[PDB]
Structures are given as structure tokens and as C-alpha cells.
Enzyme design. Sequence first.
Site: not given
Ligand SMILES: OC[C@H]1O[C@@H](c2cc(O)c(Cl)cc2O)[C@H](O)[C@@H](O)[C@@H]1O
Lengths: 810, 810
Positions: A351, A542-543, A548, A650, A654
Site C-alpha cells: 500500500h 485526508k490525514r 499529501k 480512495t 468518493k
Molecule cells: O490502499 C488504501 C490506501 O492505503 C494508504 C495507506 C498505506 C499504508 O501502507 C498504511 Cl500503513 C496506511 C495507509 O492509510 C495509502 O497511503 C493510500 O494511497 C491508499 O489509497
Amino acid sequence: QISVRGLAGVENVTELKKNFNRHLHFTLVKDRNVATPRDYYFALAHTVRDHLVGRWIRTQQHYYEKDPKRIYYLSLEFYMGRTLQNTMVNLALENACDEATYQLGLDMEELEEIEEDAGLGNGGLGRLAACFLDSMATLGLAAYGYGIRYEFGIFNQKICGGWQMEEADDWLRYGNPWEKARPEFTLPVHFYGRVEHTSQGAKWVDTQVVLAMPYDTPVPGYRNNVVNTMRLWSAKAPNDFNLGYIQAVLDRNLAENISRVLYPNDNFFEGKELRLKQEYFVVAATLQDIIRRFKSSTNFDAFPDKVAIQLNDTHPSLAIPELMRVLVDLERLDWDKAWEVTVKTCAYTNHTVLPEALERWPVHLLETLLPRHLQIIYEINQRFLNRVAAAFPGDVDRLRRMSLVEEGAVKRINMAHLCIAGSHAVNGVARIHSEILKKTIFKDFYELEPHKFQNKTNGITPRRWLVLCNPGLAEIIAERIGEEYISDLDQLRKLLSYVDDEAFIRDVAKVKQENKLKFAAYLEREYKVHINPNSLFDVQVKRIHEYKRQLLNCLHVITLYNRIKKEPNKFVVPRTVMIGGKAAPGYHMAKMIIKLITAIGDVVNHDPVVGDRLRVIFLENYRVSLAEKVIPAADLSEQISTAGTEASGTGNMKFMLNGALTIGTMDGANVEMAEEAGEENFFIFGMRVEDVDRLDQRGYNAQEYYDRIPELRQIIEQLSSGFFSPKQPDLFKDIVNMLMHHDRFKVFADYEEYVKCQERVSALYKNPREWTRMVIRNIATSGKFSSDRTIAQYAREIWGVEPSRQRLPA
Amino acid sequence: QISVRGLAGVENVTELKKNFNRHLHFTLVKDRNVATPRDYYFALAHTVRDHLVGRWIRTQQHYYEKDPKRIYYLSLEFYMGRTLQNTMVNLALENACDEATYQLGLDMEELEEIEEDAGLGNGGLGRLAACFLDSMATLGLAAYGYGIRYEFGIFNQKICGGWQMEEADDWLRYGNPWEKARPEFTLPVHFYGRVEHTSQGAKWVDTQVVLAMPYDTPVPGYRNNVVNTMRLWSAKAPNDFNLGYIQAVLDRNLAENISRVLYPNDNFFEGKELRLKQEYFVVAATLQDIIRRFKSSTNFDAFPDKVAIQLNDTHPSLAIPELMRVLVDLERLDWDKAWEVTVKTCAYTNHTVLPEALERWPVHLLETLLPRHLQIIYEINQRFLNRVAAAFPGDVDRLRRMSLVEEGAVKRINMAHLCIAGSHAVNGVARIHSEILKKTIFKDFYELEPHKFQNKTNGITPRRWLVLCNPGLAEIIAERIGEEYISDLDQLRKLLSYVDDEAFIRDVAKVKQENKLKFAAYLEREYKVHINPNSLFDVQVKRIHEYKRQLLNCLHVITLYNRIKKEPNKFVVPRTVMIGGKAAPGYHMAKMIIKLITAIGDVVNHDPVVGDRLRVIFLENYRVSLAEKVIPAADLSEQISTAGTEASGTGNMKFMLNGALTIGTMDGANVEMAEEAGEENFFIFGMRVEDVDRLDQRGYNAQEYYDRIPELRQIIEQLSSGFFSPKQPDLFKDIVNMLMHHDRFKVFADYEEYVKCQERVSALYKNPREWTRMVIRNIATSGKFSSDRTIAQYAREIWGVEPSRQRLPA
Ligand SMILES: OC[C@H]1O[C@@H](c2cc(O)c(Cl)cc2O)[C@H](O)[C@@H](O)[C@@H]1O
Ligand SMILES: OC[C@H]1O[C@@H](c2cc(O)c(Cl)cc2O)[C@H](O)[C@@H](O)[C@@H]1O
């Protein structure tokens, strides 16, 4: 009221009302005179829950009789949000319950607001798991989500003096009507101890035991009568634990701390022992449960034919050596056979490519906590590196690069390398991300085993993220093309034949305006802030992370403010700029960015010359329930990560589904979104991945941009001098210093193109008809980004199972 | 099957069956194929619980409308035991549920055994509170039990190698269907801080806050449709508690430890801070709840007319200064008026004269934990001692004796002195005990305020302790005299006209034999031990304490063994000697006594020459559910405390009601029991209180008895030499040393009379008809010892309320 919310039949409404009254009396022990609004919510929740159980029992019975291949989705995070409305939607009960509650003199929406979010995730990764569970149930797969029942989820965020404060998310305080404790399926998990070698193999002895008690939550499919299970483990001390007397009982807390709290970091690795215990706890309990269910169908040859284990990031990576441990030490299979079973069973989803997010556990931690697993990991490594050596003879640097064991100050295990070695499939989460994996960080592995590497572009569930949160839009769509699109989102393409339909254009625009009015009222009712509902709703939720680039947004906001101050009597398209998201508690820079945003708001929102032409609002406590409110209200979606950093995103999907246009870099899924809609219908700007690489090779110098862009210079000078912090002039020195001297994410490099692109956005917004037509072209091409599509691909290309839209009997 | 268990009507049985099936399906989410026996118990419990709620709601509604004087019974202990059968008995549902479950193919008694005891008490004091709640509901009083919801109750006792082992009583593991969480009535409790004096009185500031969350349990009256409430507080941390981040969340445990565990000491004061926190926690939360309910009926003159607070021992003594604090600091009443209200509201029950059991808290503890309360206590003391000084001028020693503040090494507050000063009534728990109070430890207080001192002889509920645990006996009684006695136990006197009735004699004897056979089978089924059901069942069950003299019993057992070894072929009445009870974990001597009992069993039970003529069994894990089994099976009840030490005893009354004869000293309620039945129908032996006093004045020398009693000498020599511990010859040296040199309870002094009296018991047992006739004379005169009588006296003589046997509408 509206068609997509189902039928409110006479028989159904009458029955719901009497069951509501039964639960209020018998379950809650209340009458209408003493009942609180919370009692009313619980009475409703129990009434809806009753409709689930029949289907839940018959689904699990169906799986027992048919014995299909089972899918086990292992995750440390499930960001579920609220369950009541989702359950009603999936059971076609929404209108009936709305009518029933109305006749009882209650407002259902008010009751819905009482439910706490199940906040057992941080952001994108946790929410993806939740969308995936919904889609797996909708597609009729025999799937189980396995995780941890955290007592405390993601913290609630309070803003005090412009600063983030954290408070415990005590989400279980009033009870959780959705879960069912299953103490009869309690399993032991082992920690510490030591390894003994006997005549009949190795033995792990002198261990400390923690019990894992499961709680099951139903996961309803969309109107197919399928109800799958999410099983979450809770940590319990054994009854002879430490067994002066009083202290021994109080020390039970130590063991039970394992499931106490979610680590509040997103995209960041914190190598703390408690986190490692959580990771092993979930894996050990889950695997015993998997094997138990398999034996109750001796011969593990058929194991991969009946079991798939999906590892959500590297967090459950210990499943690989734990499966080996069980197969070799306990079932007495030979190594080679056990390894074949493990590889064919396990698959791994990556991810992130951010170096700070990759899990690299100190050997000394694994040595003390999990001595047998470390031994198995070394053996896996030795055998893997022998394969590399035979494939690329003499390539000694490759051997050191590919090793599961990293040498250095402290020896570490690279958990991503473990996952690749022990899985038959490795996937990224968007096309560009999966390509980056094969080209950069996993290049060596791709060269050795190219067949292993796949792409599965992320998606979102159209149930929660359209029907639930935006019924107005779902309805006007259904009027034209029917209801089939809700479980077949590709059908939205049919909306392209309405792009010149004046009735549809007006309806799309009307739904957005209604959403904006409702959200503008919410901001006053719950947060006492006044906004102009005719302004462009410019939102980035978003976080908070440097990658970002909320800071790039901040620079644009200040640019707009400075331009208004320079020419006050010139017309500008009015904007409400909304930024929201949580910062990890220990992430100082992210906490400083929040303070900057509020500080800008403090100046901008109170300048008389600005008026209602520009407003900056920080959206406090961003979470799933808030996303369901703000996303339908948005006009412009900010997806502005430095190219190559956001694996997928994601939130972007949305916004696209809900009638916002996107300003974004060619990063993550933005690339595929622009491809689907057409680049002319997207606001693309900035460096591509290739441009970032060229800048890195040359060396990124931020001073160059400061020197050549006067507008950028003014902003930096304003920040340095204390324009946005008059009482603490040097407050933002860390931010300026980072921007000028050590910016990993090249904020300045995209500033000019970003501001220019934002001008084009404002230009289009001046023409409501052409803005809306572009919106229609976005909504119409959003079908690819349904998690039903994503899950169908996992099923066919990784798990080896066929999805089904066929109903089970009601 | 039997009449006293109610009607099993066609309509009722059919309805119970369908509601059982509904709960199994909807509540437990199971079907008949996957359901465990525990699932069946829970389905039954929920079905029975449904019948309570209607009555519960209407009872509390009735109290709101009628606004009667409310009785608040404050206790740190409620030893409730199991709830299922008790609920059925009180609702007249037992036969109907028995029939319904039988038709479903289930055995109800088997399901009843699945319920965990609610073990939130240690012994006599905790069980008295439970009996009292039952009687208050049966007598229609508006009464509320207030305590702490301990997460862990009294430990489960395991015997390993003859030694007591403790394990955590995780009684909530599977959930508690009887309780209802009421998080809406959550109240803050304050600790630590400091006192500030302003113009408008004192203020308690900078405190640490712990939340008190109530859980309500229904308390059904016997067939009167009254359902009262037991409200138990649970400790919760506030959400901003300590609010790096992870540690702050984990530290919430510290606050919540307040309600974690019951202190496992009975009749012993341990001055630990956590215990003091528990005592304040219950008092502070309860008093706020009381005042809230009072205000919802400004003017506190009527407070004592609407509120009675009963302090169960000194454990909730802080209610006195807490009420003063609230009235003076918060409600702004003047001291004298507040004190008048407090005194008229509060009453205190003393349960012990043992010096080691009296609560004397270090001033330095109260200073840090409760600084405002210490100030109020000093002011109470000053004003009280001024009254003493005016009443007895110049008597300086009286002033120091009566002071609430004890001077010495560490200054302490005498909590018993606080209770007397601040209560309008002080009572003992048996006539002899109340006389001892006025003559010895509270003599000074009696002289100052004679009107304050009362007696309320203890009782037991005839519902749990006859109808529930001994249906066979309840039935044969009802056949003769009807069912009215169950709520009017004095009616048992009518059984005196059946003492010469040969049919009744045979029935009484038959019921006992059946009880003995069932219990003898239980010992094999669950503990694999073989006993002779035709032997005399000689039982002493109660907490292990030196004052209760399990050691005197041990001496008799060894005497019997030595006599058999001396003359093997001589006839002796066969006995099964059963001793059971828990020792406080830190009470070394009590733990040694358990080891002695098992060691004697090890020798006696395996001697071929003894055969089945003598058996010694230690009853493991003695608790309420075990009491309900062993008491109906007993022939001889051992109540052999040193005269003047057992304040009342209640186990004694349970045995009397269930057809056992009593061997006992003239101590506690034994005196009144012998008085009711006639001394000829009781086996009384040993020193009276006056004889103990004479021995103390002269000086107790145990060596004298050793020298003059050869049989006693032999036993001591056997213990010293290692006869009962061959591998550890000196194992019992501590016991011998204590017996010979520092025995506070004069075991040797009663040995001769005890053994002689035991011979008379054996003689009577040889004549079954005359044994049974004496039994009938005991059962027939046991009516005084109903807790209905006790509570009626409290109501009329202390609380100022009239009991009622009138039904509320069903
Ligand atoms: O795949 C689901 C989401 O995972 C996010 C995501 C990846 C990670 O490795 C961890 Cl530990 C937390 C997280 O929220 C990605 O930053 C984002 O780009 C992606 O859409
Ligand atoms: O009054 C109930 C019982 O309380 C017992 C008793 C008194 C106490 O002060 C404490 Cl802390 C615990 C306890 O179990 C008495 O020993 C017993 O004689 C009496 O029958």
C-alpha cells in the site's frame, strides 16, 4: 419518500413498530416517559439487527454444506463507521423504518446521529478493508475479515487555540449492539519462552499465554441475503495469571493491554513492542481458527484449495512463519511441503513506497518475543537466497539487497521481503503504483519472479459512498437508468446520453446545491461558523501528511488572499476552502500544519475587505461519518500529492462519484480517473513521476523558486515576519525552514502550475451549465472505481474463486 | 411435579417455549444444531428475565407516584449467588419452566448449574446483605441496595497438595444477563486535591476525577410483584484522562482499578489505600444519586423523612462526613442544621467486636486522599467531645477513650466512633452481641446516649434457604400446614402438633436421606470421593478463622481416630466429617489449618482398620451455590466459636431450618436458637462469655490442659512428631506452638466438654426416631430467624416505615 430507499408496505411498517416497542420495553427496560433519544436509537438498532440474524445463520449454514473455498482477509484496521443506515440500505429497510419511526413520532436521521463510528482504522488502508468486506458480501464470496477489537479506536480530535488535542475514543461506552461475543471459541496465543530441540523436532516452551476471545459482527451484502462475518479478537488474561493476591489480579491488565488501543499512525512505522504483540496476536488466533474450520470440512495438500489468506500490507506478515510453525512443528509436515502450502495460500498487498512506512523489525525484539519465528525466518531467508544465487550467480550485491535480514547498526527483518518470498501473488493498489514497485523497490524480486506481480486498482463501495450518503443523487440517476447500477456501477456510462439533457443538468445542479445548503447549516448548528452556500466548496479531507501537501493548498489560499488585498474591488469567484484531517500525535510537522491552517483562517475570516469572498475552515475530527456529510457537498476535490507518493488514494474516488471536479497531480489512482473521464474533464497539473526523478538527479533547490516567483516570496516573508502569528512572530519558523531547505516533497516546484490550474477552475465555475456538464462526464465514468470491480479481480486473478450475484433464499 | 413450585398451565408452558426459541434464535444467534448447554442456560435466563421487566418498570413507577420514604442500604459486599432459580421461585415460574424445558428435551437443573455465582462478598456480612434485599422486596419497602460492581469477586479456591490456591473469579466472562448498564446516570467522584477557604465557605479543588457508572439488577419480592433495585457502581476514567499518547490511554487502567477486585478478607482490617478509595467511591456516587432522587420529588428539613441510610458495618462510614460536605459546602446549610439532618438520616450496624476487624484509618492517608473529609471529621470530633465534657466534667480519660482521633505512633481515625457519633441508631446483630457492645467496647457511648443502642438479631431468607435449596422439605411441610409459612415463617410452630405423628416423622427422615444420597453422589461425580450415606453428616462450613475454631473440630476428629485405633472391633457410630471454607490469602495460620485438615484426611481415609466408619473430607471452594447443596444434606451443624467472638452467625440458622441438629457454644445467635427450640433440643457445651472472662483474668495456661488430659497429650505429640506429615515432620510446628503458647481462643479449654457433648450426639443418632423428633422441634421453632422478621424490626424501630404484604398489580 424516495424510490431507492425501498418499499414501506403496510405489513412491514406495522411489524417494525411493534418490534421497536418490544425492544424498548424488554431490551432497554424503558417506557416512552423515561426513554432518552439514545434509548430510541438502540431500540431501532435492535429492531434492524433482528432482520440480520436469520440471514446470518442461513449464510453460515450454506457455507458449511457447500464447503466453498474460504477467503481470509487479515488486517490490523477496519474503519467501519456507523452500521445502522448501511444495514437498512443493504436489507431494503430504509423507507419502512423511516415510516415506522415517523408514526412513532421520531425522526430517524436524528437517531442515526447518535451512533458512534466504529473507528478501528486510521484512514485509507482501514477504510479500504471496510469497503472490501461490503463488496465480498455483495459478490457472494465466503469471506471473513479478521482483526483486533480495539477498546479505543482512532482518537477524537479537538482543536484548542488552533492546536490539535487528542482524546480517547471510548466507542464501547454505551455498548455495541452489532457485535456478538463468542467466548466459546476462545484461543490461546503464546509469547516469549524459548526453543527446545528434541528427536521429534523443535518445541516452543516456557511461554506466556494470552487468551484471544472473538467478537463477531455481521456484514450484509447488498440485497442478496448474504451475511458474512467480521471476527475481531479481544485479549484476555488466563485465570491463573500471576497466580500478593490483589496485585496479581490488577496485573491482568498487562496482558489485556494488547487489544486496548489502535496505533494512531497512518503511513508511518513505529517499531514499538506493543505493536508487534498486536500483529502476532491477530495472526496466531486467526490461523488456529482457520485450521480448525479446515479440519472440520489431516491432509494439507488441499489446504490452498480451500483457504486463501490475504495480507493487508505487511502488518500481518507473521502469518507466513506462523503457518510454517504450525505445519512443521505441530502437524509434522516436512519443510518443502509446508512451504508449498504456505506460498499457495498467502498473497500480499502493498500500500506504500514511502521508506518511513516500511516495517523493519529489530532482530532483538523478535528474538525475545518470538524466538521460534525468528529461527523460521532465518531458514526462509537462507533457502530464498540460495534460489537467488542459482538464478544470478556471482551477483553478491543482489544477495544483500534481497535478503530478508538487513545488516547495520541494529539487524532488522524487512517484512515486505518476507511477504514477497512467502506469497504466490504481490499486488499494488493502482496501475502507476504497481509499475513503481516493479521498477524501483521490488525490482530485484520482479526479475526473479515476474509472474508474482500484479495490479489491483482500489475502489470504493457505491452503497456507503453514493446511496447512503447522497440519496438525492442516487435517486435522479435511478429515475433515468434504473436501480441496477448500485451493484453494477459500470452502468453509469449510460448517463453520457444525458450530458445535453437540460432537465438532467438542472437536477444534478439542484442536488449539489441542496447538499451544500444542508452542510452549510450543519456548520452553524454544531460548530457556529457562517459560510456562503453560493461559493465554490474547495475541499481537501485526508490525514495530515507532508506528502499529501496540505501546505501547497495553504500557499494557494494565501495567494488568493494577497490578490484580494492588492485589488479589493476586482471580482473573484467566491470560495469556501475546507481542510480537515487528523495528525499522528507524535508528528510535529503535521501538527504545525494544522496550526498554520487555523492561523490563516483567523486572518482571512476576519478581514472586512475580504467579506464573504474567501473563507478558510478547518474541519475538526474528520472521520467516516463526517466524510459522508462533506463529500456530497463538495465542488472541488484536492488530490495534490507529489507524483509517486500516494499509492492510490480512495477519497479521490468518493468525490468523483458525488459530483465534484478534481484538481490533482498524476499520482496514484488520479491517473486512471483522468483516463476514464478524459483529461479535458479533469484539472491536472504539476510534475509527473519522471519530472520528480529529473529534479532529484539535478538536486532540488527551493531557493530558485523563491528567487524567481515574487508572489511566493511575499508569502514566505509573511510567514517569517509573523503576519499570521502577531504575538508569536517566529511560530512558523520550522515550516519556513523545511520549505526552504529540506522539503522532500517539492511544494515550491508545483506552486506556479497549481495556481494557474486553480484559475482555470474558477473560470469554469463562472459558467454553471458547463461546470455541471463536466460533472456529469465524471460521474458517468466513475464505474471502474467500484470495489465490486476490485474484488472481482482479486477473486479471479489471486484467490481462484468465482463471484456470484445470485440471491440466497430470504 | 411438586406443589410449592407453582402451576404449569397449558398457556404458560406454550408461551415459555416460544420465547425460549425466540431468544435462542434472535438473542443468542444460534439454532439447535450449534447450541451449547451454556446457550440453553442463557436462552432460559433471558426468557425468565422478560417476566421481571414489566414488574420492575411498574414498581419504580409506583414509587415515583406514591413518593414513600426510601431506604438506602450501603454495603461493600452483596453475596448474591445464582439468580435464575431464585427468580423463578419468587415469580411462581419454576414448574412451568421445568415443564417447558422438559418438552424442549432439556434438563433444567443441568442448565441451572451453568450459572456462575455472583460472588461479590466474603461470607456472613455479604450474604446478610443479600438476604436483606430479598426480605425488603418481599415486605414491599422502597429499598435500594448500593455497592460496587467488582470485576473479580471472591477467588475460586483450588486445593493442590493439601494447600489452598487462589484463582481469579472472572464471573463476567460470559456476560451477566441480569444487570442493566445505566451509563446515562454516570456520576463524577473526586480524589486528592486540596482545600481552599473563600468568603463563601470552603472549596475542594485540583482533584482527580473518576467516573462512577451504575449497573442495575432487579430484586424480586416473593410473589408480590414487587421488583426493587440493586445498583452497583463501576469505575470509569474520564475521556481526557492524562490527556505519550499510547501510555496515556493505557494509564486509564489506574482509575478503573477501583472497581476491579473484592478484598478477600472477612472479619479483618487491611489498611490499604485502594480499599479506602473503594469505600469513598461507593459513598460519593451513592449520595449524589440519593440527593438527585430527593430533589426530583431545596428544603433539606424533610430529608430524613424521605431518606434512610443504613451503614453495613463501618465500610461506608465516609457517608457521614460526605453528607456533611455536600450539605455545608455545596448546599450552604449551616453546620448545626446539616448535622441534625445527617444524624436523623444515618444508622449504623456493627457486625464484630474483634479488635483486628475494626477500621482505623491513618490520618496521613485521609489527609492526602480526602483532605476536606479529614477537616470535617476533626470538627465533628471537637463538637462531640465538647458534649462528652459537658456530660462528664473532669473525666479526661473518657475524652481520650471516646475521641474519633486515636493518638499514638501513627494517628488514626476510629471509624466505629465516627459512625456512633453521626447515627441516630446503632445496632448489634444478636442479643448477646448487642449486650457486649453496651458493656464493653461502646460502654462510654452507651452511657452518653443510651437511646441510640438497639438489637436486631440476624435472619436468613426462607426462599433461598428452604424452598429453593430444599424443595423436598418445603413440600412435606406445605402438605400439613399450607404455603403461607414461606412469607410468614412463624407458622412453622404449627409443626409441633406433628412431633408424635409417625407419618411426618418418616417423611422428615426420608427427605434428609434423599438429600444425603444426592450429595454423596455429587462428591463422586464432581470430585471422585467415596462416602457412606448412612453415616452421620458432621459439617462445619464457614470462612477459616482461628475464632471459628476449625482446630477444635480437628482435635475431635483425631480423638475419634485414636479411639478406633485403640479398640478397632468396638462399635462406633459412623461419621462423615466435612469441613469447608476459604482462608484469606495472607492469613498464614488459616492456610495452615486447611493443610492440617487435608493431612488428617490423608491418614484417616486410607487406614484399612477404620474402614467406612470415619471419613474426613475438605469441601473445596465453599460458596453460596455449594451451601445450597451441603446444608440440606447435613445431620450435625458445628457452631463452635469461642463464646463472645461470633457476633451472630447465619450459617447456624440455615442448618436449623434444614433439619440438622446443632452442636455449639453459647455464642452469637446460638443463644437465641437454643432459647427458641429449648436447651434440651440443642447440644450446648463449653465456656460461656463469663467463663472466658474469668480465665483471662486468671491467665490462660494451655499447658495445664496438656498435663491433665492424656488424650489431648497424645494428639499434640502426634502433631509434633510428624504422624500427619511423615516427609515433613515439623510441618505443623506453628500450629502446636500457637495452641501451647499463644492461643487467643482457648481451644484446649473447651476440648473435654466438646468431646463429651459429641458422645451424646452419637448416642442420639443411634435412635433414628428420637433424633428426627428433636429435628422436628428445631425446624418448628426456627421462625424467629427469618430475615422478614429482622427487616420488619429495622423498618419499625430504625427507618420509621411500615412493611406491607400487599400485592402490586401483575
Ligand atoms: O490502499 C488504501 C490506501 O492505503 C494508504 C495507506 C498505506 C499504508 O501502507 C498504511 Cl500503513 C496506511 C495507509 O492509510 C495509502 O497511503 C493510500 O494511497 C491508499 O489509497
Ligand atoms: O452480621 C452478619 C455476619 O457478619 C460477620 C462479619 C462481620 C464483619 O465485621 C465483617 Cl468485616 C465480615 C463479616 O463476615 C460476623 O462475623 C458474623 O458473626 C455475622 O453473622
